[PDB]
Design a protein around this ligand. Structure first.
Ligand SMILES: C[S@@H](CCCN)C[C@H]1O[C@@H](n2cnc3c(N)ncnc32)[C@H](O)[C@@H]1O
Ligand SMILES: C[S@@H](CCCN)C[C@H]1O[C@@H](n2cnc3c(N)ncnc32)[C@H](O)[C@@H]1O
Ligand SMILES: NC1=Nc2ccccc2SC1
Ligand SMILES: NC1=Nc2ccccc2SC1
Lengths: 294, 293
């Protein structure tokens, strides 16, 4: 849908039919990259140096990371899922080509290996070029990065492979469409070990509550014992907040209270957003959104 | 800023208070755009294809939309009065749209609320265009005055109010001195010994230095404790806004509700706030946690 025309007259305007009647705007200092890839329109620009945002990436017209606020969602998906697992040794990231979630996952010394599968090889290349603080772990020996559709990759992966699966996708318009669907989650269930955890890109409670509720229902019905939605503050996602559905394959698991608190881990002090109090607070939902958690 | 922010069928929230960014809402019809005695006030109906409904801006800053107004009004009204043991006399400085007053007046303990906003046109236009926000302005428990908040608290007795809620515009404009120490020395004085205050505490993304300065001077003026509560408001810049929730009495932990809303008859009519959201709001991202310790 959206491509180059979103930069016009000195600003980038995030106009999209997935959020009619609204658009966040950022002043453009310099366009660093702007081209169709094999799958998506990728735009990278340096924002106004008088403002805090730094370098900005958008896919299909939708802001994906900025320098200033990238840490939020990458620390919340990496730590909320791994700190809910008793011993997360093998992790899969679907999407995630900027490397941010992977960076956070590899702070855990329990992780033996993490596989990352993003459909768009140009996102990894441009993240290495323009966002080195986000992409700093893509070449780690504990990671294996492949370029491919995550729908096929989970269908091919054998049962009981992963302790945690993190699904860090673009929004549903575009190549991530089927990754918001029931067939994909049947496979995520299946490829988790019996005490596995998954979490995803759970969209906006202000814009997407119908889809978020639909997915919580079908994820429970595929066989996950518990699905709880965690909310976070991300200024450069539409309406300013994004969530993640955190799902436990096994019963008896309360993902809303950290099982292995980060504070007992050596890197808790390096984080800029997440800690155990923020983990517990993220599962408190506004009353209107409560029918995702119960 | 003023009328020039309505541009190309969009309202664009361009401001020197947040350089290089701007939230924009599509305009279906402008209903009102005029200078008041104090501020530029603009009211428009947003795109019916989107959710926002009618939108009000002052000095180019979005103040309320029909769709998300309830968040900040519930958080400031209930976080403060649910932290107080029996809040019977309340003062709202600013608040001329009536939203905070609507939430305060849910409380059966309130005997009287004074509301003092400098701009009488805000009350007039809120009655005309936001009836679900402004109904409360006519309530006989309220006395609604047009005047500056700083002069009002300077003529107010010691020990007048159980709760003071400071619902202002951002610091550029007529609210400038309401973000200053001298104003808060009066707020402390006009509170009763068990009093609570809360304010419009700006953004942890854009205004952290100011929030640090205010938290410090509020404590130094004599409040026993100051805790910042964060909330999700799409139509404030960067998507979140806070409130410094301050206790005159020592030994009070405002982060846990003292008088929980769920015991109250109107709990299930609220759209955002409950006792879990109250406790959660005091958890701050690590970059900002030093405001609360
Ligand atoms: C950039 S990341 C989100 C930003 C916060 N890290 C979203 C990634 O999802 C990938 N994506 C989209 N659809 C797919 C599929 N079908 N498979 C794998 N990866 C996908 C897309 O190429 C982005 O790099
Ligand atoms: C609209 S309300 C904020 C939006 C969410 N209820 C902010 C009010 O603060 C008033 N305001 C600004 N400065 C002052 C002073 N100095 N005194 C009282 N009220 C003030 C201003 O006229 C708005 O109506
Ligand atoms: N600004 C951001 N936008 C996103 C876009 C897509 C998926 C996740 C996010 S969170 C970071
Ligand atoms: N959209 C909103 N904007 C505000 C503007 C000024 C003060 C408080 C708020 S919170 C509601």
């Amino acid at each position: 849908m959206p491509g180059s025309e979103l930069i016009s007259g000195g600003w980038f305007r995030e106009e999209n039919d997935q959020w009619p009647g609204q658009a966040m705007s950022l002043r453009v200092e310099k366009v660093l990259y702007d081209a169709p890839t094999k799958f998506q329109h990728l735009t990278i620009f340096e924002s106004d140096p008088k403002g805090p945002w730094g370098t900005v990436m958008a896919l299909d017209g939708c802001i994906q990371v900025t320098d200033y606020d990238e840490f939020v969602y990458h620390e919340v998906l990496g730590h909320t899922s791994l700190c809910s697992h008793p011993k997360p040794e093998r992790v899969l990231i679907i999407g995630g080509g900027d490397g941010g979630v992977l960076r956070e996952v590899l702070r855990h010394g329990t992780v033996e290996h993490c596989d990352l599968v993003d459909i768009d090889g140009e996102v990894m290349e441009q993240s290495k070029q323009h966002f080195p603080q986000i992409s700093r772990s893509l070449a780690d020996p504990r990671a294996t990065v492949r370029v491919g559709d995550g729908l096929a990759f989970v269908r091919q992966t054998p049962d009981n492979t992963y302790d945690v699966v993190i699904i860090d996708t673009t929004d549903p318009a575009g190549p991530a469409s089927k990754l918001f669907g029931e067939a994909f989650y049947k496979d995520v269930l299946r490829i988790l070990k019996p005490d596995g955890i998954c979490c995803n890109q759970g969209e906006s409670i202000w814009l997407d509550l119908e889809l978020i509720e639909k997915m919580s229902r079908f994820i429970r019905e595929t066989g996950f014992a518990s699905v709880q939605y965690a909310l976070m503050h991300v200024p450069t996602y539409p309406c300013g907040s994004i969530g993640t559905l955190v799902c436990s394959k096994k019963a008896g698991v309360d993902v809303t209270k950290p099982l292995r608190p980060v504070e007992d881990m050596p890197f808790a002090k390096d984080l800029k957003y997440y800690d155990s109090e923020m983990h517990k607070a993220s599962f408190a939902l506004p009353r209107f959104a409560r029918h995702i958690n119960n």
